[PDB]
Design a binder for this molecule. Sequence first.
Ligand SMILES: [Cl-]
Lengths: 415, 415
Amino acid sequence: TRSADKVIDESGATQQELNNHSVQHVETVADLPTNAKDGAVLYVKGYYKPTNLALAKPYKGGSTRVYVAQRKDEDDGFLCIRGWVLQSETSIYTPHMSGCLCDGTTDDTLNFDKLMYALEKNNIAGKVIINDDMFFNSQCPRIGKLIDPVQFNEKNAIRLVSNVDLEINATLNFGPFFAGSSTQPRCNILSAMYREDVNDWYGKNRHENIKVYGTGTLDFTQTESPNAVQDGYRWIIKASVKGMEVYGLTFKGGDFANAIQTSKTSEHIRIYGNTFSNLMSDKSLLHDHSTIYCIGKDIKVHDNVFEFTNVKGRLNACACELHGSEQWFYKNVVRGYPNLVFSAILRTDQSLDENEVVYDQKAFDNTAFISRSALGYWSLANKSAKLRDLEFYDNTVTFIEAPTLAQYTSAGVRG
Amino acid sequence: TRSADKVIDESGATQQELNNHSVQHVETVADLPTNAKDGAVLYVKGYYKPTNLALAKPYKGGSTRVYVAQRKDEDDGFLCIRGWVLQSETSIYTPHMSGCLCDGTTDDTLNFDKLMYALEKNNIAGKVIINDDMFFNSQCPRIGKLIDPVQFNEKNAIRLVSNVDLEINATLNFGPFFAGSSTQPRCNILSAMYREDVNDWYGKNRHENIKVYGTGTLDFTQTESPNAVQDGYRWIIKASVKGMEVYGLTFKGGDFANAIQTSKTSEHIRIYGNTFSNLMSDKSLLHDHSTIYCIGKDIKVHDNVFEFTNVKGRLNACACELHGSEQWFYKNVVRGYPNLVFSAILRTDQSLDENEVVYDQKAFDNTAFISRSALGYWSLANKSAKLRDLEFYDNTVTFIEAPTLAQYTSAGVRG
Ligand SMILES: [Cl-]
């Protein structure tokens, strides 16, 4: 029974010196050993044990990790597990790598926030790719930029992060947790809204370079509730941002006042190639929906499909509200909405200052099959905000009949 | 003290046979050993030692490498370090992997060119992702397609490469090296301009499939100088290219005659989703700026933000010059420029041949807040080039007052 120190290699090195320099493996993060040499390397085959060794990708959320003895007590379940530090040169991550199951039915809210909060907390630029279906059904931890010092009590599933691409190529299912109620009426499902103190209602510390995109689907069917009441604070994405892009995605079901709303000081938003389908249910008590609610400057909303096939959205809904300057709505299709576009000049603290003059609102090359209004102009009465110019050109509009009182009653419309 | 050859495995193989087949690790490229078995594999944890083991990504520019004994003297500091050959199946690279620090203050010009020149020299198609801030402050080596046989003496920071995506998701800072002077007035910061001999002024050997994109920023503030003089040869990107795309990026500060100029025989350029901000300083001796200078055919300039908030660019600047055929300028916003678009029909060796007829110049759906000209038509006097057609349609133009003589003097405008 001789020492590894006593065995010698055709290089002249101890088996012991070689063993200290060997890339080794363990099955799962649970198997990360607690007394390894500082600087040890492990390939971890999967986050958890394989659920089924017969299927094509048995091992999920595998990682290469280096042990950093001085961080051995840090366990974020992602970048550093009991000092084993995740190696990812290109900063491209998946939810499996933070212990998400991605089985479409396990609530992955907590384990997904271990990924997103890690990238937030460490100012990491990168990409999160979602290739497998997920379920969200609980509150995303209110830490870091998801603290709620104003106490709006918006339900959140996902922490958006500055300089992170969220690439959604599978179905995200949102569950009944996120249904509205009289007691907690508000929601912001994928939050890009940082409020630093009790006074910071509109997110003065803007996020930067938010990208939400991909070929997947965000399904809010399971959030639909007769209990949900009208509140302006019901969003798929509420952002305070400089530089945001939301593209490619299908959004369907739920009870939202808006799919996407920006904030007072927001700039450079691009919303394109998406499908917005039935974002306000028949049977809730909501009674108003505007799919996109454009606050701030340089916002372009284009090449999107807006559709209501239910009754209630065919009786009161608008595809886009233009609340500020340099806001264009172009090359969209709008199916069944009463209202195509609103120019809304509201002299109110969430948007326009006293004496503010709004310029460069454009709406062009849209198709609309609508029953009520192609262009709506709103303001408060007797206030100091003014519109310089709005151009509404080259739109192809067909006015169609709204659903009947019989269809309203057959569909159980409430609200 | 027994031979590894004498120790035997539950497989019946020598510890020596196993040791020859073990993936091993070293800390840094400096640690790459000089007498390993041909075919040995090392995981190199980082390019350099970690700067700080407490932070989230302690190890940067880690690599897997195979020793190729026959290349043991080749050291490009990237694909082959003393015969250790970099393994990267998808050809996705980062500047850390060539020994860039990416700390935003160390001059990474040389180490970044070790990456770009390697991909050039070996005709490698792939992607370079930049997720961390960099600084450039010296001349990019004049080798390969950056040789200067015409002796224009353009200062260059970055070698663009055919069939390489440059993905910039952080801030690139350009330093005072790149400031103009009377002695070396010319620059081409990210060069896609190959000139093969002393006679090849306009890049006859076009690059192919240049992509420059991302969510980041190119900051030329530190290049701004009272010493910089007007020269046409002052560019962020001067390309001779077939197939180029520049998208998503913010460009700000500096003293450029153009942000982007193409060449006589260039084709299929797409310039979109960018922000061009203050690309000519108040205090330099430059007196003319056109953001985009379109030479060749099939060039589309769209969905960009052009802005001068300084004085000098609010007194002489144009967003786009159309110098050739199939050139469209559309869906842009232009803030503060005197001039929106120029149709420039110059019968000159850098562009139009004798008797050349320019066709299909279009400018549509733009917003402009400008003080001098919506559409400018230029030519040389008494020459043989002609314009067939220019269409300028569906633009929304507001003529605003230029800055005052007081604002000019308060801003120290020179030039
Ligand atoms: Cl049109």
